[PDB]
Design a protein around this ligand. Structure first.
Ligand SMILES: NC(=O)c1ccc[n+]([C@@H]2O[C@H](COP(=O)([O-])OP(=O)(O)OC[C@H]3O[C@@H](n4cnc5c(N)ncnc54)[C@H](O)[C@@H]3O)[C@@H](O)[C@H]2O)c1
Ligand SMILES: NC(=O)c1ccc[n+]([C@@H]2O[C@H](COP(=O)([O-])OP(=O)(O)OC[C@H]3O[C@@H](n4cnc5c(N)ncnc54)[C@H](O)[C@@H]3O)[C@@H](O)[C@H]2O)c1
Ligand SMILES: NC(=O)c1ccc[n+]([C@@H]2O[C@H](COP(=O)([O-])OP(=O)(O)OC[C@H]3O[C@@H](n4cnc5c(N)ncnc54)[C@H](O)[C@@H]3O)[C@@H](O)[C@H]2O)c1
Ligand SMILES: NC(=O)c1ccc[n+]([C@@H]2O[C@H](COP(=O)([O-])OP(=O)(O)OC[C@H]3O[C@@H](n4cnc5c(N)ncnc54)[C@H](O)[C@@H]3O)[C@@H](O)[C@H]2O)c1
Ligand SMILES: Cc1csc([C@](C)(O)c2nnc(Nc3ccn(Cc4c(F)cccc4F)n3)s2)n1
Ligand SMILES: Cc1csc([C@](C)(O)c2nnc(Nc3ccn(Cc4c(F)cccc4F)n3)s2)n1
Ligand SMILES: Cc1csc([C@](C)(O)c2nnc(Nc3ccn(Cc4c(F)cccc4F)n3)s2)n1
Ligand SMILES: Cc1csc([C@](C)(O)c2nnc(Nc3ccn(Cc4c(F)cccc4F)n3)s2)n1
Ligand code: NA
Ligand code: NA
Lengths: 268, 268, 268, 268
């Protein structure tokens, strides 16, 4: 029997097979979950990518900044899962911060229009997806979002760290609302993962200094982590999301679970 | 001798004599500081209010959402303090969250345009003011912002709590930039204060439930505070800001000082 | 298939069928784990209680304050599980604070001899058990301890809260040592549970005031928990421990998982 | 006028002129405080050291593990300050952890007798001095203890980090008790300071590895600190204690003020 047997789970955030959501989606399918997938912009590309998952799943378009996509979401999910059925899980694996607010651009040089777009996609949309999906979720259900520990400041992350701090606060309010439906809301704070944006910065796309800074963060993370940290392996992160989606953490809500090799609990 | 003798300090946030900034400005002046004041919108009203302070101080217009006011700020401050002079301190006592994002309106019913405006004024502007003023600040200088503990969710505060969570993260990045100038950046987390907006909610402006919830927050705050908490007295908060503006906390930066009667350290 | 199929798990802390450890042991067994149980003092009583579990399990004597019991632990466990076999998990569900240090006695009136005994059993023993068992634990293994959120002070808990603060720090160092063996170390922060000591205080054993204070803590806990909190149900806590014992949280170490209905994330 | 003008302050923890308490005592005297000093064991040595302070002050013997020294403390202080007078400040700058629980000895190899002595001196004694001195403290008074951030584990510190975690919890309970007297209780979390024990470990007294670990911690601290960190300068730490002893932080209790150059707010 699978960890997610009989559970209907919506998974957002798939762009490539390197996406954390792809690995969440693959592990949930191996664990017997029935998926509904959401994608943004490059729908032709994600269709080809989602065809690489172990099982077939409906693919729905969802731009979190689009009010019409959100207003129709619940109805579109119902048509995909069939009338009389509700979701048991929701995975928010969405984030974006323009290069003006994250990378090499000075912290003070990020224009608010760009910071605002980043906070809309990365923090406010966790509340927006919860508003749209809670009326179609079963009691005992679970909403999971992806977090990057923003308790301490660090180089390059800049406005993304601010957006993550806003997301942590949003998660605590979403828990109050979701609790009325018997639904839990939690964040998984993952260690750094070699996704396309991460591979670009380490590889030198943002220059020598930025690459050296992220390489130092990765090296230090693995050193600090009592059990080590492998940036090239999204599996432990995907497994943690599936633990939260299961019925095995039923008294955890408005919380953060750290899937970071324990690096945040160690100074040196 | 005064705690702030010979120091040039910019104080933003004065609207009425109930404003936390008014009490900070009054305590700073009693302590021998030379002030520069900034005000938004009702300049005629704030001129009459600033005439009630113990000493005369220049009043400059500053709308934090206005890029032209920001771009000219340093130049306008220099003309008020005199050429060759720099500020030893900056007080950010600015906050705003539309009623759609704070109050009786459900957490999910706040439109992003309103949330975005609130975060711009309440969080991003701490960075925007630091960007404008750091080139005109002396080493040993101090930037102080006002916060309301957002570590745990609570009724009615809603998107303001999300804005305060974003501000705490902003302060940690401001500290990195300000450190290059030998300047400290900190937040003062005050307990609830009976300012105009607070007096309105307790008084019943937002209805029976909202008034009851805020009364319960206040009552509980005073109960958990080992030294109690007087919501009608802004002096202990003003004194704490002045301590951070002084040379008496010289190794504290990117941090939060709680002027809350110790309420946050107690469960019951 | 069970969540804990094929895993050998040591479970300490059983005294009655109300013990949190009893519910952890019962859930682990339903999930296909092979248990080794440890008990203190009343072995005849605990044998009768352990006979009430779904499956038979060896019972070993372990007084954590007894260096001879500690020195022989690994050898005695090996004889119970069979030569060539190792443990996949350890559950530390042990705690004690004399009434001078927890209850109605003023915080200042607890003698150090009593405080010291409480910290030995409640905090130091987590490290002492990890020292004794790590040489007989498999890579991928898990050590779990029971905690009660000590981040904020509260009435009556007194020196137990100080012991829990020490335990949280111990867990972070245990993680460093356990990481060398590929073993994770975590704490489960449970909400209040109606165990024998808890039922006594609520029931009036320590007088009118102490009973009223604990009733107020319980009532408030259920109020702040977005998903509520049932003090008479240890199952959600037992399930959370089993999640940490499983392979489903493999990148979490030196950490705390809150099985508290989300109460700690909410102010009111 | 001085920051501590007219204030009677008890300062414990002077052993050499490198002691953090020596610098607290020197700064408080420059700020016009009237001191009462306490010393342990080497009274002849501390007399010669205390003679190097800017002003004369009574020296009282105080071993925190000695019940008779604590029972007579208040009476002995009254005789030194004169009948009819009370203290306005108390500085706890005491700490000890045997080499078995801090340094090169493995974390698991510290015997409880040694850990217990370390917790008695470093954590329990903060409560013991508060019990003895609160009946002779004025309203508006302040108790300050020295802390080393124990939120994250680190090499060598070992059981001292555990004792500091216990101290942080003790401080929160002492605040509840002190609040009944109108007295605040806070901790100052200092960055690393080149005291005799610190100079010995960096210098190589505990071997090559331990020296390299502490040198790395110091180097990293200064790097992480937005305003830098000078381990050879206790003045910023002494100034922070004097800020807490003053009337300038009157609504802060059961709290921690970080005098660490802001290093704890930055990851890298
Ligand atoms: N090191 C890391 O990669 C790292 C670390 C911790 C947490 N996280 C978080 O995990 C999540 C997934 O990130 P990832 O690394 O897999 O990156 P990714 O690029 O693979 O996924 C991010 C996704 O956000 C989607 N998205 C962006 N704007 C959108 C919009 N307007 N509407 C809908 N979807 C939109 C993109 O299409 C993409 O699928 C993010 O929230 C990220 O911040 C990442
Ligand atoms: N209980 C409380 O009142 C409480 C508690 C903790 C922290 N705080 C924080 O303290 C600060 C001051 O609040 P207050 O209670 O004195 O309220 P206030 O209304 O007296 O002051 C808030 C100020 O923000 C200014 N402001 C708003 N929009 C602006 C803009 N675009 N440009 C520049 N200034 C603008 C207003 O003119 C006003 O002077 C805020 O950051 C608030 O969040 C308040
Ligand atoms: N509300 C609560 O009950 C609550 C809340 C959160 C966490 N916890 C923690 O959970 C754990 C289990 O508590 P419980 O509520 O099940 O109580 P319990 O009394 O049922 O179990 C505590 C156990 O500690 C054992 N113990 C005491 N001294 C010992 C010694 N010297 N050697 C070995 N074992 C010894 C006792 O025999 C008993 O089995 C403790 O660590 C407790 O602090 C309890
Ligand atoms: N890097 C550091 O040095 C560092 C960093 C942060 C915090 N602190 C803390 O600051 C405080 C002062 O430390 P320090 O560095 O000045 O060291 P220190 O050696 O100069 O002072 C420690 C003092 O504790 C006293 N003491 C020990 N046992 C005692 C007993 N039984 N009774 C009474 N007094 C006793 C000693 O006599 C000594 O005066 C300690 O609590 C320490 O942990 C130190
Ligand atoms: C927390 C995190 C790490 S990578 C990630 C997402 C969802 O892939 C991103 N969303 N928006 C991003 N924008 C930018 C702009 C520049 N980058 C590269 C970059 C990184 F990928 C990581 C750190 C710094 C950095 F500059 N990434 S990266 N989120
Ligand atoms: C942290 C805080 C408390 S009062 C405050 C400011 C600066 O006065 C505000 N800035 N924007 C505000 N917007 C609104 C909307 C509704 N209110 C009233 C209100 C309160 F004043 C306090 C709590 C809840 C609440 F609804 N306040 S109030 N900020
Ligand atoms: C954290 C916690 C809650 S109940 C618990 C244990 C393992 O049952 C205890 N271990 N030692 C205990 N000692 C005492 C002394 C007095 N009590 C009763 C009591 C409680 F059970 C709970 C809160 C306060 C209180 F006074 N409990 S209770 N530990
Ligand atoms: C927090 C801190 C740093 S130095 C300090 C005190 C009060 O001077 C100490 N109290 N007891 C101490 N015992 C030991 C045993 C060995 N040392 C040297 C040493 C250090 F001084 C610092 C880190 C590790 C280390 F091994 N120190 S050091 N407390
Ligand atoms: Na109170
Ligand atoms: Na509730």
């Amino acid at each position: 029997t699978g960890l997610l047997d009989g559970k209907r789970i919506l998974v957002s955030g798939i762009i490539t097979d390197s996406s954390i959501a792809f690995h969440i989606a693959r592990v949930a399918q191996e664990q017997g979950a029935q998926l509904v997938l959401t994608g943004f912009d490059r729908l032709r590309l994600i269709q080809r990518i989602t065809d690489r998952l172990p099982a077939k799943a409906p693919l729905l378009e969802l731009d979190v900044q689009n009010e019409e996509h959100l207003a129709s979401l619940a109805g579109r999910v119902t048509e995909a899962i069939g009338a009389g059925n509700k979701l048991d899980g929701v995975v928010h694996s969405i984030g974006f911060m323009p290069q003006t607010g994250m990378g090499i651009n000075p912290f003070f040089d990020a224009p608010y229009a760009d910071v605002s777009k980043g906070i809309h996609i990365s923090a406010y949309s966790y509340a927006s997806m919860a508003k749209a999906l809670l009326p179609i979720m079963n009691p005992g259900g679970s909403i999971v979002g992806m977090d990057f520990d923003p308790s301490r400041a660090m180089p390059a992350y800049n406005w993304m760290t601010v957006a993550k701090s806003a997301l942590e606060s949003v998660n605590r309010f979403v828990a109050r609302e979701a609790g009325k439906y018997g639904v839990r809301s939690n964040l998984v704070a993952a260690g750094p993962i070699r996704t396309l944006a991460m591979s670009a910065i380490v590889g030198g796309a943002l220059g020598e200094e930025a690459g050296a800074q992220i390489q130092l963060l990765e090296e230090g993370w693995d050193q600090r982590a009592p059990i080590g940290w492998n940036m090239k392996d999204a599996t432990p992160v995907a497994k943690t999301v599936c633990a939260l989606l299961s019925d095995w953490l039923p008294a955890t809500t408005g919380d953060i679970i750290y899937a970071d090799g324990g690096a945040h609990t160690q100074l040196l």
